[PDB]
Amino acid sequence: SITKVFARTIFDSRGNPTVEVDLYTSKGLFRAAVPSGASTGVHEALEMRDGDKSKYHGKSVFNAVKNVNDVIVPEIIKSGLKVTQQKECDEFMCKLDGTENKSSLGANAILGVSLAICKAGAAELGIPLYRHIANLANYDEVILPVPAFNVINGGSHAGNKLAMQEFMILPTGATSFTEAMRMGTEVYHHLKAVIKARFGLDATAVGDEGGFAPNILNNKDALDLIQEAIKKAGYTGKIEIGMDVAASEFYKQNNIYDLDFKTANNDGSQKISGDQLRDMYMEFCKDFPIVSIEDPFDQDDWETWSKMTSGTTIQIVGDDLTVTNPKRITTAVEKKACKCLLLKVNQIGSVTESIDAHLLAKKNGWGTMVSHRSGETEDCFIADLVVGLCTGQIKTGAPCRSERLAKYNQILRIEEELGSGAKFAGKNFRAPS
Amino acid sequence: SITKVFARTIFDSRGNPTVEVDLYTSKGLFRAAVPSGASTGVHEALEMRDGDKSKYHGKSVFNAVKNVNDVIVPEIIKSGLKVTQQKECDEFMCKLDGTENKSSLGANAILGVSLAICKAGAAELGIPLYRHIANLANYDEVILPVPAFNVINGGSHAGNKLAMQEFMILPTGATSFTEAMRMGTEVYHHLKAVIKARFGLDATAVGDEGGFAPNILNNKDALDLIQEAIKKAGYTGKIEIGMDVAASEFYKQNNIYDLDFKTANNDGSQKISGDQLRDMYMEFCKDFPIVSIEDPFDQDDWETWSKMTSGTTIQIVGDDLTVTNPKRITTAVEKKACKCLLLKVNQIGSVTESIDAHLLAKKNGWGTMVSHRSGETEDCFIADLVVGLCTGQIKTGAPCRSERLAKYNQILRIEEELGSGAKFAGKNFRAPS
Numbered sequence: 001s002i003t004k005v006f007a008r009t010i011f012d013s014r015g016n017p018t019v020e021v022d023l024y025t026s027k028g029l030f031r032a033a034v035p036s037g038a039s040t041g042v043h044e045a046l047e048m049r050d051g052d053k054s055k056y057h058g059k060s061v062f063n064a065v066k067n068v069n070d071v072i073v074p075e076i077i078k079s080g081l082k083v084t085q086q087k088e089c090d091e092f093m094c095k096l097d098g099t100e101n102k103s104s105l106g107a108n109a110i111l112g113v114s115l116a117i118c119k120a121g122a123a124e125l126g127i128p129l130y131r132h133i134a135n136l137a138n139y140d141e142v143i144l145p146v147p148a149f150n151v152i153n154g155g156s157h158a159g160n161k162l163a164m165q166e167f168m169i170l171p172t173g174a175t176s177f178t179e180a181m182r183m184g185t186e187v188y189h190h191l192k193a194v195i196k197a198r199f200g201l202d203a204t205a206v207g208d209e210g211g212f213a214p215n216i217l218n219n220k221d222a223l224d225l226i227q228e229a230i231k232k233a234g235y236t237g238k239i240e241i242g243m244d245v246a247a248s249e250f251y252k253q254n255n256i257y258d259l260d261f262k263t264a265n266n267d268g269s270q271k272i273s274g275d276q277l278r279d280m281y282m283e284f285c286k287d288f289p290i291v292s293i294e295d296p297f298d299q300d301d302w303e304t305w306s307k308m309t310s311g312t313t314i315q316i317v318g319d320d321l322t323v324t325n326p327k328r329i330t331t332a333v334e335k336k337a338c339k340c341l342l343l344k345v346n347q348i349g350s351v352t353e354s355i356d357a358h359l360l361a362k363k364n365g366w367g368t369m370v371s372h373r374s375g376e377t378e379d380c381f382i383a384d385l386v387v388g389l390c391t392g393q394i395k396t397g398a399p400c401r402s403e404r405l406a407k408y409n410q411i412l413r414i415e416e417e418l419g420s421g422a423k424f425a426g427k428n429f430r431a432p433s
Numbered sequence: 434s435i436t437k438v439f440a441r442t443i444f445d446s447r448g449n450p451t452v453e454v455d456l457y458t459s460k461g462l463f464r465a466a467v468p469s470g471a472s473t474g475v476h477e478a479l480e481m482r483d484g485d486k487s488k489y490h491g492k493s494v495f496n497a498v499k500n501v502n503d504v505i506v507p508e509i510i511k512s513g514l515k516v517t518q519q520k521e522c523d524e525f526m527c528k529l530d531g532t533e534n535k536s537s538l539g540a541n542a543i544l545g546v547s548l549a550i551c552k553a554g555a556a557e558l559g560i561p562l563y564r565h566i567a568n569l570a571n572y573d574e575v576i577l578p579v580p581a582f583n584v585i586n587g588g589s590h591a592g593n594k595l596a597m598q599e600f601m602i603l604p605t606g607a608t609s610f611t612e613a614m615r616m617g618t619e620v621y622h623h624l625k626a627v628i629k630a631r632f633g634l635d636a637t638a639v640g641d642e643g644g645f646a647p648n649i650l651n652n653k654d655a656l657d658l659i660q661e662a663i664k665k666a667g668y669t670g671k672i673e674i675g676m677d678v679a680a681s682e683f684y685k686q687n688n689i690y691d692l693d694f695k696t697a698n699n700d701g702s703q704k705i706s707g708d709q710l711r712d713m714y715m716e717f718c719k720d721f722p723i724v725s726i727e728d729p730f731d732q733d734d735w736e737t738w739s740k741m742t743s744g745t746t747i748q749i750v751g752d753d754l755t756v757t758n759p760k761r762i763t764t765a766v767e768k769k770a771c772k773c774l775l776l777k778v779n780q781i782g783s784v785t786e787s788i789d790a791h792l793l794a795k796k797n798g799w800g801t802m803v804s805h806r807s808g809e810t811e812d813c814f815i816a817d818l819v820v821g822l823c824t825g826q827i828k829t830g831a832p833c834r835s836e837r838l839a840k841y842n843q844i845l846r847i848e849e850e851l852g853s854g855a856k857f858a859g860k861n862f863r864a865p866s
């Protein structure tokens with residue numbers, strides 16, 4: 001039974017307020033923190049901010065914190081639900097909310113309590129959190145994931161010209177998670193050396209996710225840079241590349257992608273319809289070891305999505321397309337729009353729904369890549385989530401900034417706990433379990 | 434009694450390996466991680482890296498980890514010392530090391546175990562860590578500190594032209610720690626807006642400590658920028674400025690400071706002897722609300738240090754000068770070289786010595802500013818240390834990057850625990866207890 005639930009305001013990796021929940025059972029205190037979130041969006045669960053631009057730039061969360069403390073807390077204490085009843089507790093809170101997008105209480109309110117209940121539940125049962133998640137998802141085995149280290153930024157998370165949002169490396173050819181961390185950090189540093197040389201020391205500063213953001217023009221330039229770091233590190237053929245185009249941002253008029261790559265007059269110099277953008281992807285695919293591409297098109301450019309998924313043998317990740325929403329996932333499944341779900345727990349709002357989102361996708365042949373948010377915290381929960389859900393692939397930042405390393409370090413501790421019989425997804429990252 | 438001690442390698446906020454120690458007593462597991470460190474230096478305790486440039490760029494720590502596991506661990510388990518005997522445990526390890534700078538076992542080896550023992554000791558006694566530290570240091574009361582948020586970078590931590598290393602803001606005029614976090618983040622954001630405007634979006638990327646690093650020329654430019662953010666935020670007169678000149682880096686020939694501010698030929702354009710540099714400081718002091726200056730001169734320019742300390746009424750912080758070393762502190766005390774110790778626990782190597790370093794300084798009228806390292810971890814130990822040592826002032830990064838916010842968030846949780854009777858150093862930050 002829950003003896004106490006108390007939320008407080010803490011600050012995320014970007015300097016903005018966010019919710020932190022303390023939950024008590026006779027076993028003790030269980031703490032969880034909530035990452036980023038859409039303060040308003042039309043597909044994902046709404047994180048409740050205050051909007052008073054006077055206080056914290058309209059980003060405070062005293063409201064979400066209050067909904068937890070004086071609404072969720074007393075109600076769930078009297079509900080008599082045990083932390084061992086994840087689905088029931090999550091269900092209760094949603095009922096309590098009434099809205100479909102958790103707009104009454106706030107998804108950040110619900111998720112914080114939901115995450116805390118999960119950690120408490122694993123403690124009630126006397127098992128580590130990754131095991132409790134596996135059991136909730138019906139897995140008998142867990143597996144160490146392949147990390148997708150964001151290393152070069154553009155579009156967002158940083159701001160130059162480079163329209164493609166993320167360029168990541170994936171040590172698919174690593175023998176273990178330890179070895180993948182080594183391959184990952186070494187390349188990261190060698191890449192720092194390269195960017196410093198090619199663009200000067202000042203270009204080695206980092207964006208929200210710890211990745212460099214040199215003033216590069218063509219996306220291909222980014223890939224070449226990465227390709228050099230891998231060679232320098234001597235990891236050619238062990239590391240593959242991954243992308244997140246976030247194409248929804250530059251989708252302009254009908255069938256037109258652009259953004260002028262952040263140039264109010266770069267127009268025409270990038271008057272490329274989806275098919276031209278799709279061809280461009282294929283060139284990259286044969287020229288670089290690109291194994292996964294996220295959001296190649298706008299979240300509503302369904303037809304170019306299906307075409308690309310049908311015509312390639314690489315992973316096509318749905319982020320803005322699916323929005324961790326089972327309704328969106330279902331449509332994307334019917335349309336064969338993609339073959340991978342980017343799992344962002346705060347997008348849906350609870351642990352139970354997040355797990356169901358993953359099982360849906362997995363049931364329909366998809367892969368699942370667990371994802372952090374731009375605004376993360378020191379909470380390392382998704383590290384246990386990715387191991388527990390046996391997805392084999394996590395995207396939680398470059399190995400720089402501790403809100404990122406908090407997750408990676410935790411997966412290494414888990415690895416150490418699994419012993420010699422710890423399995424690393426590796427080349428089977430797309431669907432290892 | 435210690436039933437088990439096991440170290441492992443984890444990654445710091447910069448992507449480099451560092452030591453993490455797990456310590457067990459019948460009360461459970463107590464974990465601590467070690468930050469940055471001088472892999473070799475002549476004044477501070479030496480952190481042991483491996484040097485094999487093939488592995489992790491010569492930065493691995495399997496040696497330090499091994500010294501813990503197969504040397505420190507069995508020895509301290511059989512020693513029969515209790516975690517409640519901080520001084521004895523720390524003493525034992527130093528004996529065990531034999532060297533003066535902890536070069537046999539590695540300061541990173543010793544400090545990790547030392548930090549873990551401290552957390553275990555507070556648990557043995559049933560009190561929070563900040564209280565256990567207060568009691569170790571003989572304090573009856575604890576006090577919430579004034580945060581020194583590094584916001585603009587130069588010299589190191591980033592790399593432009595700006596030779597002065599750090600420019601920080603200090604909400605000395607805040608009513609509480611909560612209010613100081615608000616004042617701190619708001620200014621940080623307003624400053625992001627300003628830098629974006631004046632130098633473009635790309636200039637808002639951050640360095641090792643979460644602070645922006647625009648390509649500014651004159652240090653005065655940095656101060657003006659900050660001054661604008663404070664005005665925009667509407668906090669003029671509540672926030673003061675702090676600096677860390679790290680002058681040791683640009684100290685060239687006899688009585689000559691320069692660095693050409695990172696220009697192989699900026700020579701002459703900054704042929705300034707100490708006295709010219711000292712005058713420059715005074716101009717800043719009357720023109721901007723500068724309350725504290727760290728390392729105004731080279732760690733051996735003793736005479737210009739004394740002159741400056743004697744002639745001003747602001748805080749003069751010794752970082753490279755003192756190196757958390759009681760021998761250096763003693764000399765600086767005799768010479769009246771400064772009036773504040775920057776406390777970096779890993780510089781000295783143990784909790785006991787760190788506490789003694791603080792008491793020495795405090796006994797001689799100095800202030801103590803607890804400091805993080807460039808390469809931090811998600812460990813929030815120094816947050817309890819600064820509250821416990823009643824220093825009233827901590828320098829743990831900009832409110833950006835979670836290895837920084839881990840500390841700030843922890844001080845807010847402590848604040849919440851102290852209740853209404855929680856005292857905030859504020860204007861008395863220099864020596865509040």
Ligand SMILES: [Mn+2]
Pocket residue numbers: 244246294295319320
């Ligand atoms: Mn995306």
Ligand SMILES: [Mn+2]
Pocket residue numbers: 677679727728752753
């Ligand atoms: Mn310094």
